Design a protein around this ligand. Structure first.
Ligand code: SAS
Length: 109
């Protein structure tokens, strides 16, 4: 029981990176309650997106979410050096329960 994410992804500075988060019709595909977290090495996780494509305050406009079917995604557009980090998704999966993805390490070329 984990959501599927690519282990790693790279992009050039100023370009975009997209990270997918694939589950099933019982979680990612069944609800609009996908969240994304950014974690720099040895630091606490930052909430970047909730409810598929809502941003907390302080998250730049260049981070966005989308979802189609059983796959949600996070795009980091206008890639900056500080965007190098591990990124995790999560979903609601029914009955007051949540499930996390396995994480993607994003590097800048
Ligand atoms: O500042 C904020 O906006 C802020 C927002 C935060 N959002 N946290 C989350 C984390 C996950 C979700 S979610 O995509 O799972 N959505 C939901 C929605 C309703 C019930 C359960 N889950 C929803 C909100 C958490 C802390 C904060 O400070």
């Amino acid at each position: 029981s984990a959501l599927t994410q690519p282990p790693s992804a790279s992009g050039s500075l100023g370009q975009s990176v997209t990270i997918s988060c694939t589950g099933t019709s019982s979680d990612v595909g069944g609800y609009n309650y996908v969240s994304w977290y950014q974690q720099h090495a040895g630091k606490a996780p930052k909430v970047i997106i909730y409810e598929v494509n809502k941003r907390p305050s302080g998250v730049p406009d260049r981070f966005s979410g989308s979802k189609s079917g059983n796959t949600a995604s996070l795009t980091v557009s206008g890639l900056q050096a500080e965007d190098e980090a591990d990124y995790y998704c999560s979903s609601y999966e029914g009955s007051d329960n949540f499930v996390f993805g396995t994480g993607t390490k994003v590097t800048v070329l």
